[PDB]
Subunit: 262 residues, 4 copies
């Protein structure tokens, strides 16, 4: 047996990036895991089998988290295939870089919908079963951008700040139960979400030099002058899901190479 053996986890947006790192670490720690993205992909079999390599039950369910009916379908699918959702990781999220004056109205709305409101919908749908069973984990993937601001990220900083506020309330409403709710706040992790920003910097300011752009990007914000890894974010999710975190409630686990310390 392992520390999360028998626990059923759902990780939204988890076929790539940080979500896949979290799903891998939870499965390595013994949890059954449901993967998720917007639409079925040819890679689903290979990604399921990668996560299943550690001897737990793994599934994959395509669902757009901005649609509350599809969030519900994801949860019901998990209940049918594996059992009650015990660990919910709200991870799916998007970014759009723009000054406030020209920030597209629909991009603002989309970031709020996915990065904040979808976590509320999923949490609302999962809490009754967790309360009935006397146990739960809700793990929200926020950001350093939920604790401080950065230029040209108004919608994202707003949504991530909001997600941290939501985390606090859910934790307080469950504080006398076996359900906890907490947020992980990563600094920069080298995923496509960050790669696309570095590419824009490279083209705009460094003649296409990705190495120069990466160092500048990273060093503007992250004192460690290194990226956080998806595995490290997964390790924080395992820690929050473990029994040693039974009394960690409504807080942020910041994994950011020193960004918020300065």
């Amino acid at each position: 047996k392992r520390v999360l053996s028998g626990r059923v986890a759902v990780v939204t947006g988890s076929r790539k990036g940080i979500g896949l790192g979290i799903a891998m670490r939870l499965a390595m720690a013994g949890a059954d895991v449901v993967l998720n993205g917007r639409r079925q992909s040819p890679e689903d079999s290979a990604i399921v089998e990668k996560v299943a390599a550690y001897g737990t039950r793994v599934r994959c369910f395509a669902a757009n988290m901005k649609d509350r009916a599809q969030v519900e379908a994801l949860i019901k699918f998990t209940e049918k295939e594996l059992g009650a959702v015990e660990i919910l990781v709200n991870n799916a999220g998007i970014q759009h870089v723009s000054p406030v004056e020209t920030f597209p109205s629909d991009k603002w709305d989309e970031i709020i919908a996915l990065n904040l409101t979808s976590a509320f919908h999923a949490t609302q749908l999962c809490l009754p079963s967790m309360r009935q069973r006397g146990w739960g984990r809700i793990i929200n993937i926020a950001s350093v951008q939920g604790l401080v601001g950065s230029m040209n990220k108004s919608a994202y900083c707003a949504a991530k700040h909001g997600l941290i506020g939501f985390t606090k309330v859910v934790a307080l409403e469950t504080a006398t139960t076996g359900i906890t709710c907490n947020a992980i706040c990563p600094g920069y992790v080298y995923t496509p979400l960050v790669e696309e920003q570095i590419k824009a910097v490279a083209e705009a300011k460094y003649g296409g030099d990705m190495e120069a752009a990466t160092q500048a990007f990273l060093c503007e914000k992250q004192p460690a002058k290194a990226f956080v890894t998806v595995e490290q974010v997964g390790d924080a999710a395992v820690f929050l899901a473990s029994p040693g975190a039974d009394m960690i409630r409504g807080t942020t686990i910041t994994v950011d190479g020193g960004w918020v310390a300065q």
Copy 2:
């Protein structure tokens, strides 16, 4: 004669409650002021005359801040009547008290729309002029609930946390200019928004005794065991609009009787 003399200010949701207090204190400090609520009222002329007793130019314009077109209409009306909007106070806000599990989906969306997204829309519309003119104040009325959580207020805490995150980004994007953006975080103020909550507490737990319910309501959260006043919130807005706050950027002015200190 007075520190804000000749400044043109728009205060959203300002015919009653905190917004009216803010409009009054800004006018007292010399600002011309545009009042605002969702729909025209028979009291509009009386409320305008009350604010106009401070000897500045006062107007009133009905505009539902959840409708971006009406936000634009409010700004355009102010520009036509008084001149460019120099001080923008994003104050209009709503509350709904409910546990997360039963929180109505459309009330969540409404709180996010007004308490967060409306402030983004108004700020977006006002910033280009402020940059051209070399001066501006964006003052966001957040809450202690933007810095900590409280039970049964998930949507509101999320929106107010988000508003504070938005404040930081706007301030950073304008940091080298004469435009500042900051948030005021009141604790409990005795307005209808709070009176309705106390009424519910009185009915549920105190047999209708509003005095007992008020003391319990206050002393749960607010160490001063007294309410903040609308005038005190207005005085914080006057401070933020004044030359002494030229280098106050991206921060919170918390007026809460000690709530966040503990």
Copy 3:
């Protein structure tokens, strides 16, 4: 003039931020006692400059690291002007060093002045404020009390501690007419900062103070401009005013955006 008649003491206030605060308090109508370690031939001129605003101004020499001298400053104020109603704990020092080589004596001195002396002064002033039903304790912290910076371990510790102390004092007085709050400035161009820029200029920029000043400022302060002593003074006046009767245990951060990012 919103502070008419109030007696204020500003520690370390013959230059820098403290002088800016004393000036603004006097402009707002307060009587003011200036302070520094040792008597200065410039004392008379500095008092006259603050007295230009028509209030009662005194100067008393007292090393704030010596509790007995802190007491002498409070007693002097009580006999000369009356009860201390506004206490501004401003005197402070800096020492820049990596942790490994931080001198033990400098660590102790920074804690003693930047944190413990504020406790001593507050303890001595609170009984009178409680008796009279009114008081303002204003602690000059820093952005370094909310975030860390390299080579400033003792100072960040002391300033963090001063903010913690502020919260407790405010909570213990929350149902009274006494408030306690902290002001957190970012960089202000005083000798405390100029000495650091000089060291940077010599180390990295061949002595060029204009280049060094920009590099120093822009490392931390998004406004790319200094906060001014007048602005810090304006924050003190705001906290001392009736609009701030319910501002308790908080930080007023005047920092050009430093803590926002």
Copy 4:
């Protein structure tokens, strides 16, 4: 075999309370551990046996952490007996409850000396070896009282806030190395430090009723209405010491039953 196998840890003030829970959890995770208190005790051998139950090397060294020369002796003793100090846990701490007006000067000084300055001394003495070896963990046991204030605990809140500020600086000065520095912020844990406080309020206010005193003590501050355990604080220290925390730098891990979330 285990995650901290081969690492040499020193935990100050570790023969009872949270320090012992941390020492136990570090040894369970494979670390060799040096225990410490002010003076030799007849109980020392039994405490060593408790920690040595997990099959690692254990030592005990009496040293008053307020005396820099004894701090140095503890480090040199560890270097002689087990090897280079790789994990430093600054845990020893004291409390004194008093209003500010009557807070004894000597007590204030003692709390600052132990709860803040001792950690600086120990960190200063351990950092050179850690830098030479390219690895280290400095784990500072702060408190919720380092993030918010509580009545009658002025010295302690000041020292704990200061410890968190110190943590940030050390982390920033080491951010590009394999050395991290972080703080753990427990809420209430039922150690002798808290039990003595509850006994005192029980006699002074609750007629000797320890159940009533405990209910009031906890429920004033801690939404979970339950104590954090020494084992949970130990688990957080193990997490910070593990490779998954290589990029956790200058932050707080708050284990508090929701105290700071509200």
